[PDB]
Amino acid sequence: GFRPINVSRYGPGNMTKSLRDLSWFLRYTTYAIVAGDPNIIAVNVRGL
Amino acid sequence: MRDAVTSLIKNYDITGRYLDRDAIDSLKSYFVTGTARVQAAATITANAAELVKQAASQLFGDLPELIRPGGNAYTTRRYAACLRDMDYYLRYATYALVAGDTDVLDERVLQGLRETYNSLGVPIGPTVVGIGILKDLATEKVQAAGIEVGAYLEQPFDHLISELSETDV
Amino acid sequence: SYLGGRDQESTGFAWWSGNARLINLSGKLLGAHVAHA
Amino acid sequence: MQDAITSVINSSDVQGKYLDASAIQKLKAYFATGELRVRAATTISANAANIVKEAVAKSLLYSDITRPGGNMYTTRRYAACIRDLDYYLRYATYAMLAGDPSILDERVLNGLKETYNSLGVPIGATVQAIQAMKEVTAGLVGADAGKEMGIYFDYICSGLS
Amino acid sequence: MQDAITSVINSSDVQGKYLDASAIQKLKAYFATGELRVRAATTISANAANIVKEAVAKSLLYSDITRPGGNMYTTRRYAACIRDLDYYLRYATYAMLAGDPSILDERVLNGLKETYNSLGVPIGATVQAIQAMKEVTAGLVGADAGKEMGIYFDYICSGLS
Amino acid sequence: MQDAITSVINSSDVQGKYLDASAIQKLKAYFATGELRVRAATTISANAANIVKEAVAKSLLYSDITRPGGNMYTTRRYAACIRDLDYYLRYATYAMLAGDPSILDERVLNGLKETYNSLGVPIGATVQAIQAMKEVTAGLVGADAGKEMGIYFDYICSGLS
Amino acid sequence: MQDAITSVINSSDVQGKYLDASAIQKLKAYFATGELRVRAATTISANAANIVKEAVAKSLLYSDITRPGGNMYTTRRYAACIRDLDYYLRYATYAMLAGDPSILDERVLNGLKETYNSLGVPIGATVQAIQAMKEVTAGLVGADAGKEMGIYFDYICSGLS
Amino acid sequence: SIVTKSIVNADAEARYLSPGELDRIKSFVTSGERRVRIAETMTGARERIIKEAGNQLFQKRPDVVSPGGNAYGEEMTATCLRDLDYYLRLITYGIVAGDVTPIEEIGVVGVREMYKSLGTPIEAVAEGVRAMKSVATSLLSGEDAAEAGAYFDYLIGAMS
Amino acid sequence: SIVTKSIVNADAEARYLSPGELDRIKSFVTSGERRVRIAETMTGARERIIKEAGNQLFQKRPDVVSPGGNAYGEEMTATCLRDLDYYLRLITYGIVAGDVTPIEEIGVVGVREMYKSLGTPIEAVAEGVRAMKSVATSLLSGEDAAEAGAYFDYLIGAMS
Amino acid sequence: TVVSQVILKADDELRYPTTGELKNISDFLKTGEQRLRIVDTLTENEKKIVDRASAQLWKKRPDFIAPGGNAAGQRERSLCLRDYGWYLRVITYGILSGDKDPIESIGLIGVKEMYNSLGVPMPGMVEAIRCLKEASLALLDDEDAKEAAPYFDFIIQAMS
Amino acid sequence: NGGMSKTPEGMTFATDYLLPKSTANRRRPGPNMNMFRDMARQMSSK
Amino acid sequence: RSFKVTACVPSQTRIRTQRELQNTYFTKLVPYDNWFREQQRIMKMGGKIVKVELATGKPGTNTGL
Ligand code: CLA
Ligand SMILES: *[C@H](C)[C@H]1/C(=C/c2[nH]c(/C=C3N=C(/C=C4\NC(=O)C(CC)=C4C)C(C)=C\3CCC(=O)O)c(CCC(=O)O)c2C)NC(=O)[C@@H]1C
Ligand SMILES: *[C@H](C)[C@H]1/C(=C/c2[nH]c(/C=C3N=C(/C=C4\NC(=O)C(CC)=C4C)C(C)=C\3CCC(=O)O)c(CCC(=O)O)c2C)NC(=O)[C@@H]1C
Ligand SMILES: *[C@H](C)[C@H]1/C(=C/c2[nH]c(/C=C3N=C(/C=C4\NC(=O)C(CC)=C4C)C(C)=C\3CCC(=O)O)c(CCC(=O)O)c2C)NC(=O)[C@@H]1C
Ligand SMILES: *[C@H](C)[C@H]1/C(=C/c2[nH]c(/C=C3N=C(/C=C4\NC(=O)C(CC)=C4C)C(C)=C\3CCC(=O)O)c(CCC(=O)O)c2C)NC(=O)[C@@H]1C
Ligand SMILES: *[C@H](C)[C@H]1/C(=C/c2[nH]c(/C=C3N=C(/C=C4\NC(=O)C(CC)=C4C)C(C)=C\3CCC(=O)O)c(CCC(=O)O)c2C)NC(=O)[C@@H]1C
Ligand SMILES: *[C@H](C)[C@H]1/C(=C/c2[nH]c(/C=C3N=C(/C=C4\NC(=O)C(CC)=C4C)C(C)=C\3CCC(=O)O)c(CCC(=O)O)c2C)NC(=O)[C@@H]1C
Ligand SMILES: CCC1=C(C)/C(=C/C2=NC(=C\c3[nH]c(/C=C4\NC(=O)[C@H](C)[C@H]4CC)c(C)c3CCC(=O)O)/C(CCC(=O)O)=C2C)NC1=O
Ligand SMILES: CCC1=C(C)/C(=C/C2=NC(=C\c3[nH]c(/C=C4\NC(=O)[C@H](C)[C@H]4CC)c(C)c3CCC(=O)O)/C(CCC(=O)O)=C2C)NC1=O
Ligand SMILES: CCC1=C(C)/C(=C/C2=NC(=C\c3[nH]c(/C=C4\NC(=O)[C@H](C)[C@H]4CC)c(C)c3CCC(=O)O)/C(CCC(=O)O)=C2C)NC1=O
């Protein structure tokens, strides 16, 4: 039941919050790798 | 905590008097609005878990400094804490709306709130905007339910504004 | 809020009447005619 | 209580950027000097009570502090002054392994000046006491890590004065 | 605590059924007896220190248990007796005002039989105490509510003995 | 706590002799299999909210204990059953690193059975639920650690009965 | 927690009468022997450390108790063995000064028989120890005072066996 | 008040106002015109109740008036009616509150430690408020004597 | 053990074992073959090492050898020679357990109260196990001598 | 109900219930036959409600019936149709009790995370109760629609 | 092999790496000055 | 004097407050002076009380603590 969403139906002000999250999902993954503990991934994702 | 009835008790108890004509007409002025108080308090809690969600998305779409890494609403550790710390301002505004005065707001939420937020780095600034986005709104769901709105249903909200925010002028 | 896509239940149209998802979609209606032309 | 891992990431969190090449250059020295940090930590815990015995024998005994009138005359206060002198060896070794002096800011320098001005403890006798064991540990763990251990003692001694 | 409004609700959802008309015909009787129950809780509490004064003077004053040798003579424990007797009268009032004796099962009759037989407190004097308490309050609130008090005073002493 | 490390210590200590060949023959089989038991605890710690879904839906769901009249019907007791089943997973994995079910004696199976009698949950449904977590863990961790899983849930299966 | 003055008084209060002349002689004989008892207890309190090494040196050392397999093998169990022996001496000097066997029920003999069975400590070396402890404290304080001390040590072993 | 007790239980459970706690406020404010008429009757006849409870106290228990008692004197009688003036005036405060808690935080919490210090028998005041209960139901109509008589009958068991 | 101390802190904060903390176990299961190569050396060389370090101990403290001292005679050496034999068993138990914790459950927590009643000067057996430290480190490699010396230095600070 | 609010209040303050809640108890107990006009018109009209709301849910949000959803199989949809009348049962417990005490302790305490133990997500099941409110309030008469409407309204706030 | 401990100690420090150096730098506003920013961008044509 | 109590307290708030799980069915030794209060606290939370035995009582004494 998944379809890829179009940008024109979505909105440019709506997707500029969206695309920075995709860097932010791995920016905290790079933070947690050098932190040596996955707690910061596993606490900022619950209920997102 | 301290009702509009019980505030008028120790407005009269400390001088040692009975209930005169001014006591019998100011208290009747509270009771004629009591049907309008309670039915407004139902529809405020109609979608109160939605009402904080519509306000803070309208807050953070209005002040986008508080999302991008700046002041503290950055992670969901902050953001879901922000929605809870918003939700106390909605929930205690229901109590003083029923209680008449703002003395429930005076010694449950207001005392120490300048000193809790300063110890965390939480700004007092957009918190005033966060109550300013609710007090005008809260009035939308009172208006769409058909209850009149004005004198009160703000009596509580700007007492959370004029006493929390620091005096400039 | 919307941006459902092309199903039965976002637009109210079924698998037949198989264009009327593109009455209001401006861009994919152009891809209908250019594939048709 | 935030460490060198947290202070680097929170320097890049509020900037919003990734790990930039100056910070990994800081993080490389934090990770490559771990066997210096472990060897320093395992030897101070190897003789924790020898160091504080030689520390008070360096600078505190046979003063006026031990004579009556002084603030180490009863055997209550000699156990107190030697517990508190142990605490500046525990928390120095705690900030040694985390690499940041922010443990001492939260834990030990919160109400230290409030305590010692309420019992009338001589502060000027304490700032030479922790300076005395700065020599003793650096003679015990070596000149490399004693230079490293000497910063957190001097951060305590800066907050003490 | 199960209530008489809620035990008939607790009788239904254990079976998982909706509210039967025989359960409604139970409930419509208990709503209509509302004023008869709430007024007796006022006038019991209006002199609740006075009922326990007259109840102890019925069958415990001047007797051989009040004389030395018996276990209510010292005044250490006779003041712990009438305070223990006062908790029976207050928990009878909650037992009437709820309309179910489930309140007495969960916080009066839990371990009360064993803690009296350990101490050597006479149960036969306590049943003689609390039965004399019932005949004061049935003449105090009227015999229409006195038979309502008689369900719960005799739920205690039948459970205690 | 008594580890399998401390089992062969305390056995050899009360004998007074040393770590001979009969002692260390358990040690060499401990450390060869110790790499595999720490790999099971990694995959458990990522799926810890998921094994409780796959086990309750295997054994407990679509049943009469879920129906009203059953004990696991209301959502308070439905919540406080997944609490009491998450804890049975986590203390089982403490024995996976331990190699000894002594951890289950001290913290889990000390006074649990009398609490379940005084609360009145069915004991055989728990053993039906603990046996549900036998195979879904070994479906994730592999049957080689499933034999290592094969002991401590069966210690719960024998100890609670 | 019942003195021999009070056990005269509590016997005189279940009767509810005044001080009989027969009960006067039951405390004047207490007031006769009291100046022996204060002088006895100070000689125990000086040599309280000299008693406990001697009783251990008569029966406990170089025996089956200090084997590699035994009760008092490790130095935590040896630490408790002098600690559980010190309370037998210390409570007896309360009992000798009170002139009562009462005080060693409320502090010593609550559950001490089954407590030694639950841990795995034999009672047979204990009754060989306190009876050895009775002889060294007999000649230390004099056999007239030790006859008063000797009866309470036999009140220990009656409860412990 | 009722509104004070309804807030402080819904706040202590960290909750909004209940549907079961909103109707009691709806029951409060529609009984608001009724309850304030009751306290106007007690304040409007407040000289009568203090005079005719003193006449039904002192005949009913005359040992506090006869000399060597506590309330003996030409002033000490007149300050005893000062003490009965206060426990009429608080009953007007509890009636407009709904709850009796403006008498709990004012007039009833520390009485047993103060009439012990003053030499007044505490039970003799409990014959007084029971006397002024009988005047106030004779002053009032049929239904409201169940209302205003209960606020007296809280205070009878709370003194003695 | 290394497992047990890492369990009872993660249990006390009511979580699982976090995967930054599992690697103290993941490391030591590879080096468990190292420690059983270490523990076999010290047990076989023990009955060599007991008959000179006690004689090394008696040079710096000879009054315990003297009459009046607590080690006078050959029958009063097995109180002392077996005690250093008792202590090296706890050292080798501390080798195999990984951390220092079997000595805490066996050999440290009453030594102040034990040797006070036994009449032994307690500052000698710290020097006696200081004599144990100097010669046991010579029998192994220096990587083993640094690790096995750290268990010795807790037993130095045990009696000091 | 209102009576278990008062006894569990008055137990820890060790008091009898005062007149501020005894008037509040008696005011609930005169409204049983008013509340019983609402409880049977929910009862025999149950199956008219239970699929008029169930069709209302999937015409609003069809993902629980979509393949890969939650009630895509019939053994889940037979469960999920049952839970509506289970929620219609416990709501009618609340209108009879006039408070929150049955509707708390049966189907509301802990449902926010124990749907997450199952497959069913939270805020779609919030939409299921909100469409069940208008499926019941259209059947209810208008002057007693406003009484039973906050009891449906509490379930929306506590679940979301 | 299977070393009990790890890492090369290295020659020095970790002593004074504590003070970070960066151009924060400054605060071009970027958020709620957008309306103002648009006016300034709009003004540039002149 | 003290009572050897064997009681079991269901916590019955623990899923709201989401705390750690400790285990009840305890066997403790409550002294004499507060058991008209300590038993009441077990009665507030619905705690079943199995056996109450006074450990070292001498029941019915008049003096003697
Ligand atoms: C210029 C021509 C044109 C265009 C662009 C449209 C556009 C549209 N029509 Mg449409 N229509 C037209 C002419 C047109 N109409 C004419 C002339 C007819 C009469 C026959 C129809 C009858 C028609 C129906 C019956 C309805 C529409 C609908 C629609 C809308 C949805 C289309 C859809 O889902 O297709 C659906 C396509 C199919 C179901 C495929 C059917 C294929 C048929 C059966 C093939 C016929 C035989 C063919 C020649 C093959 C022979 C093979 C040989 C080997 C035997 C869309 C706006 C719908 C509407 O109102 O939505 C707004 C609607 O319900 N159309
Ligand atoms: C949708 C396909 C994409 C998307 C869009 C999106 N997200 C939000 C809102 C937020 N996103 C976050 C993100 C995070 N918080 C974290 O802690 C972490 C881990 C470091 C991440 C990635 C947060 C806190 C919010 C709320 C605050 C905000 O408004 O930004 C929106 C706005 C929703 C609204 O209008 O209310 C949108 C459109 N999120 C995704 O994951 C997809 C990439
Ligand atoms: C969100 C819209 C706003 C914001 C919120 C925010 N608050 C916190 C933390 C707290 N808020 C409180 C406030 C209260 N506690 C009370 O008891 C009462 C009276 C009922 C009030 C008003 C408290 C105590 C905290 C501390 C945490 C706690 O609750 O124990 C945070 C967390 C700070 C952090 O980064 O950790 C946040 C983000 N901040 C904003 O920017 C918005 C204006
Ligand atoms: C000893 C080297 C010096 C000294 C010690 C001394 N201290 C006290 C009393 C206290 N000392 C502390 C110390 C600390 N508290 C902390 O929380 C920390 C950080 C973790 C430290 C280092 C505290 C709290 C007290 C109060 C008592 C207590 O611990 O409970 C005394 C006794 C003072 C008195 O008058 O009784 C003494 C003698 N004083 C010296 O002279 C030495 C220089
Ligand atoms: C008085 C008319 C009768 C009487 C009373 C009496 N009871 C005690 C001792 C205690 N009573 C209880 C009872 C309760 N605890 C509760 O929590 C509740 C629920 C409200 C009840 C009813 C308990 C547990 C004890 C034991 C603890 C203790 O004794 O302190 C005594 C004291 C006995 C004594 O001191 O020896 C007395 C006198 N006994 C009588 O003689 C009257 C018949
Ligand atoms: C030594 C002569 C013999 C011996 C003693 C021994 N006792 C224990 C344990 C306990 N002893 C007590 C007794 C008391 N505790 C008190 O508080 C009081 C009153 C002040 C008394 C009389 C208790 C409660 C214990 C259990 C506590 C504990 O075990 O620490 C031990 C310890 C057993 C163990 O393995 O831990 C020992 C060794 N045992 C002998 O073999 C000697 C003959
Ligand atoms: C009257 C029939 C009974 C009685 C009355 C009496 N009262 C006093 C003196 C005082 N009484 C109070 C009591 C209150 N003050 C309050 O503010 C309130 C709550 C609103 C109460 C209940 C106080 C403070 C006094 C002190 C003097 C004063 O009023 O300022 C007296 C005088 C006692 C004396 O010894 O002089 C008397 C006589 N006493 C009786 O005997 C009657 C039973
Ligand atoms: C870590 C060791 C440990 C365990 C195992 C433990 C169990 C435990 N389970 C309990 C309740 C419970 N236990 C269950 C049991 C179950 N639910 C089901 O569906 C099954 C039939 C069964 C288990 C598979 C239920 C339904 C309750 C709630 C009882 C109630 O709320 O009245 C309680 C009472 C308080 C609470 O609800 O938390 C404890 C203490 N406590 C511990 O300290
Ligand atoms: C590891 C746990 C452990 C401890 C603590 C322990 C102590 C211990 N020390 C003992 C004797 C003794 N131990 C010593 C000790 C010493 N002799 C000296 O001169 C030196 C100063 C010192 C040791 C180097 C002495 C003097 C005695 C005899 C005491 C006496 O006869 O009074 C005995 C009785 C005889 C025996 O079984 O050995 C025990 C049980 N045994 C243990 O298994
Ligand atoms: C007494 C209070 C109480 C209730 C009512 C309750 C219901 C309950 N609903 C369940 C499942 C379910 N609930 C839903 C419901 C939905 N999915 C959607 O898209 C919709 C929004 C919603 C439709 C009504 C579905 C689809 C399942 C089946 C999921 C499964 O078991 O795999 C289950 C697990 C399996 C079962 O028994 O069916 C229980 C126990 N539990 C309780 O403790």
PDB file of N, CA and C in Angstrom, chain K residues 1-42:
ATOM      1  N   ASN K   1      48.618 -13.586  21.870  1.00  0.00           N
ATOM      2  CA  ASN K   1      47.511 -12.874  21.245  1.00  0.00           C
ATOM      3  C   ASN K   1      46.343 -12.709  22.192  1.00  0.00           C
ATOM      4  N   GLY K   2      45.214 -12.257  21.652  1.00  0.00           N
ATOM      5  CA  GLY K   2      44.024 -12.037  22.449  1.00  0.00           C
ATOM      6  C   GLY K   2      44.364 -11.125  23.602  1.00  0.00           C
ATOM      7  N   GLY K   3      44.968  -9.986  23.296  1.00  0.00           N
ATOM      8  CA  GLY K   3      45.416  -9.102  24.342  1.00  0.00           C
ATOM      9  C   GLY K   3      44.354  -8.678  25.322  1.00  0.00           C
ATOM     10  N   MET K   4      44.746  -8.732  26.587  1.00  0.00           N
ATOM     11  CA  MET K   4      43.911  -8.362  27.713  1.00  0.00           C
ATOM     12  C   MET K   4      43.565  -6.880  27.662  1.00  0.00           C
ATOM     13  N   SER K   5      44.539  -6.080  27.247  1.00  0.00           N
ATOM     14  CA  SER K   5      44.406  -4.633  27.104  1.00  0.00           C
ATOM     15  C   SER K   5      44.781  -4.228  25.669  1.00  0.00           C
ATOM     16  N   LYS K   6      44.367  -3.041  25.249  1.00  0.00           N
ATOM     17  CA  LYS K   6      44.639  -2.587  23.890  1.00  0.00           C
ATOM     18  C   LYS K   6      45.176  -1.169  23.842  1.00  0.00           C
ATOM     19  N   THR K   7      45.617  -0.764  22.645  1.00  0.00           N
ATOM     20  CA  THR K   7      46.148   0.570  22.236  1.00  0.00           C
ATOM     21  C   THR K   7      47.609   0.926  22.475  1.00  0.00           C
ATOM     22  N   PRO K   8      48.126   1.809  21.626  1.00  0.00           N
ATOM     23  CA  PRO K   8      49.491   2.273  21.711  1.00  0.00           C
ATOM     24  C   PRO K   8      49.299   3.542  22.497  1.00  0.00           C
ATOM     25  N   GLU K   9      50.086   3.682  23.542  1.00  0.00           N
ATOM     26  CA  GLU K   9      49.939   4.803  24.439  1.00  0.00           C
ATOM     27  C   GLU K   9      50.157   6.111  23.730  1.00  0.00           C
ATOM     28  N   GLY K  10      51.179   6.146  22.886  1.00  0.00           N
ATOM     29  CA  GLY K  10      51.503   7.339  22.150  1.00  0.00           C
ATOM     30  C   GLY K  10      52.467   8.195  22.934  1.00  0.00           C
ATOM     31  N   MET K  11      53.069   9.144  22.252  1.00  0.00           N
ATOM     32  CA  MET K  11      53.989  10.032  22.926  1.00  0.00           C
ATOM     33  C   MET K  11      53.489  11.052  23.916  1.00  0.00           C
ATOM     34  N   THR K  12      52.337  11.657  23.645  1.00  0.00           N
ATOM     35  CA  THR K  12      51.898  12.731  24.507  1.00  0.00           C
ATOM     36  C   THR K  12      50.447  13.177  24.582  1.00  0.00           C
ATOM     37  N   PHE K  13      50.260  14.069  25.543  1.00  0.00           N
ATOM     38  CA  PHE K  13      49.070  14.857  25.835  1.00  0.00           C
ATOM     39  C   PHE K  13      47.696  14.375  26.178  1.00  0.00           C
ATOM     40  N   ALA K  14      46.811  15.062  25.463  1.00  0.00           N
ATOM     41  CA  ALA K  14      45.342  15.016  25.709  1.00  0.00           C
ATOM     42  C   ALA K  14      44.984  16.035  26.847  1.00  0.00           C
ATOM     43  N   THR K  15      46.028  16.694  27.375  1.00  0.00           N
ATOM     44  CA  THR K  15      46.146  17.690  28.405  1.00  0.00           C
ATOM     45  C   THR K  15      45.539  19.023  28.117  1.00  0.00           C
ATOM     46  N   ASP K  16      45.809  19.512  26.921  1.00  0.00           N
ATOM     47  CA  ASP K  16      45.344  20.800  26.527  1.00  0.00           C
ATOM     48  C   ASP K  16      44.839  20.756  25.114  1.00  0.00           C
ATOM     49  N   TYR K  17      43.797  19.977  24.911  1.00  0.00           N
ATOM     50  CA  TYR K  17      43.173  19.916  23.628  1.00  0.00           C
ATOM     51  C   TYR K  17      41.804  20.396  23.959  1.00  0.00           C
ATOM     52  N   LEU K  18      41.603  20.689  25.237  1.00  0.00           N
ATOM     53  CA  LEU K  18      40.304  21.141  25.729  1.00  0.00           C
ATOM     54  C   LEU K  18      39.669  22.375  25.118  1.00  0.00           C
ATOM     55  N   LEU K  19      40.464  23.369  24.766  1.00  0.00           N
ATOM     56  CA  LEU K  19      39.884  24.567  24.207  1.00  0.00           C
ATOM     57  C   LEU K  19      39.720  24.508  22.715  1.00  0.00           C
ATOM     58  N   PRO K  20      38.465  24.494  22.326  1.00  0.00           N
ATOM     59  CA  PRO K  20      38.057  24.468  20.929  1.00  0.00           C
ATOM     60  C   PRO K  20      38.263  25.826  20.280  1.00  0.00           C
ATOM     61  N   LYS K  21      38.486  25.863  18.974  1.00  0.00           N
ATOM     62  CA  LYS K  21      38.613  27.134  18.273  1.00  0.00           C
ATOM     63  C   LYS K  21      37.715  27.142  17.046  1.00  0.00           C
ATOM     64  N   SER K  22      36.776  28.082  16.955  1.00  0.00           N
ATOM     65  CA  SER K  22      35.902  28.141  15.778  1.00  0.00           C
ATOM     66  C   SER K  22      35.275  29.504  15.515  1.00  0.00           C
ATOM     67  N   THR K  23      34.904  29.766  14.266  1.00  0.00           N
ATOM     68  CA  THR K  23      34.233  31.016  13.950  1.00  0.00           C
ATOM     69  C   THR K  23      32.765  30.731  14.200  1.00  0.00           C
ATOM     70  N   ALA K  24      32.397  30.444  15.439  1.00  0.00           N
ATOM     71  CA  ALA K  24      30.970  30.114  15.558  1.00  0.00           C
ATOM     72  C   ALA K  24      30.093  30.035  14.284  1.00  0.00           C
ATOM     73  N   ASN K  25      30.232  30.938  13.317  1.00  0.00           N
ATOM     74  CA  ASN K  25      30.613  32.324  13.520  1.00  0.00           C
ATOM     75  C   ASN K  25      29.482  33.302  13.314  1.00  0.00           C
ATOM     76  N   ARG K  26      29.205  34.065  14.353  1.00  0.00           N
ATOM     77  CA  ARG K  26      28.175  35.102  14.300  1.00  0.00           C
ATOM     78  C   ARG K  26      26.771  34.583  14.088  1.00  0.00           C
ATOM     79  N   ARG K  27      25.851  35.495  13.834  1.00  0.00           N
ATOM     80  CA  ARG K  27      24.476  35.103  13.666  1.00  0.00           C
ATOM     81  C   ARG K  27      23.668  35.769  12.574  1.00  0.00           C
ATOM     82  N   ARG K  28      23.896  35.386  11.328  1.00  0.00           N
ATOM     83  CA  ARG K  28      23.040  35.897  10.281  1.00  0.00           C
ATOM     84  C   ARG K  28      21.744  35.226  10.680  1.00  0.00           C
ATOM     85  N   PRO K  29      20.693  36.006  10.792  1.00  0.00           N
ATOM     86  CA  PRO K  29      19.478  35.456  11.382  1.00  0.00           C
ATOM     87  C   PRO K  29      18.757  34.281  10.732  1.00  0.00           C
ATOM     88  N   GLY K  30      18.435  34.290   9.449  1.00  0.00           N
ATOM     89  CA  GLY K  30      17.752  33.141   8.850  1.00  0.00           C
ATOM     90  C   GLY K  30      16.481  32.407   9.344  1.00  0.00           C
ATOM     91  N   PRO K  31      15.363  33.057   9.691  1.00  0.00           N
ATOM     92  CA  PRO K  31      14.220  32.292  10.145  1.00  0.00           C
ATOM     93  C   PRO K  31      13.009  33.156  10.070  1.00  0.00           C
ATOM     94  N   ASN K  32      12.824  33.889  11.168  1.00  0.00           N
ATOM     95  CA  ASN K  32      11.696  34.797  11.324  1.00  0.00           C
ATOM     96  C   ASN K  32      11.999  36.185  10.803  1.00  0.00           C
ATOM     97  N   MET K  33      13.203  36.404  10.290  1.00  0.00           N
ATOM     98  CA  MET K  33      13.510  37.592   9.518  1.00  0.00           C
ATOM     99  C   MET K  33      13.224  37.397   8.037  1.00  0.00           C
ATOM    100  N   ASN K  34      12.530  36.315   7.695  1.00  0.00           N
ATOM    101  CA  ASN K  34      12.232  36.012   6.302  1.00  0.00           C
ATOM    102  C   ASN K  34      11.405  37.105   5.640  1.00  0.00           C
ATOM    103  N   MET K  35      10.420  37.638   6.358  1.00  0.00           N
ATOM    104  CA  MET K  35       9.607  38.713   5.806  1.00  0.00           C
ATOM    105  C   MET K  35      10.496  39.928   5.553  1.00  0.00           C
ATOM    106  N   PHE K  36      11.360  40.228   6.521  1.00  0.00           N
ATOM    107  CA  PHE K  36      12.305  41.329   6.405  1.00  0.00           C
ATOM    108  C   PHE K  36      13.296  41.044   5.282  1.00  0.00           C
ATOM    109  N   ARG K  37      13.724  39.786   5.201  1.00  0.00           N
ATOM    110  CA  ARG K  37      14.679  39.351   4.189  1.00  0.00           C
ATOM    111  C   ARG K  37      14.112  39.516   2.785  1.00  0.00           C
ATOM    112  N   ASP K  38      12.831  39.195   2.624  1.00  0.00           N
ATOM    113  CA  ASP K  38      12.174  39.322   1.328  1.00  0.00           C
ATOM    114  C   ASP K  38      12.157  40.781   0.890  1.00  0.00           C
ATOM    115  N   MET K  39      11.881  41.674   1.837  1.00  0.00           N
ATOM    116  CA  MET K  39      11.856  43.103   1.560  1.00  0.00           C
ATOM    117  C   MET K  39      13.243  43.569   1.139  1.00  0.00           C
ATOM    118  N   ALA K  40      14.267  43.042   1.808  1.00  0.00           N
ATOM    119  CA  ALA K  40      15.639  43.407   1.504  1.00  0.00           C
ATOM    120  C   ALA K  40      16.020  42.824   0.163  1.00  0.00           C
ATOM    121  N   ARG K  41      15.628  41.583  -0.108  1.00  0.00           N
ATOM    122  CA  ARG K  41      15.900  41.018  -1.409  1.00  0.00           C
ATOM    123  C   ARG K  41      15.142  41.837  -2.447  1.00  0.00           C
ATOM    124  N   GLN K  42      13.889  42.173  -2.159  1.00  0.00           N
ATOM    125  CA  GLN K  42      13.073  42.954  -3.072  1.00  0.00           C
ATOM    126  C   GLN K  42      13.663  44.337  -3.317  1.00  0.00           C
TER     127      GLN K  42
END
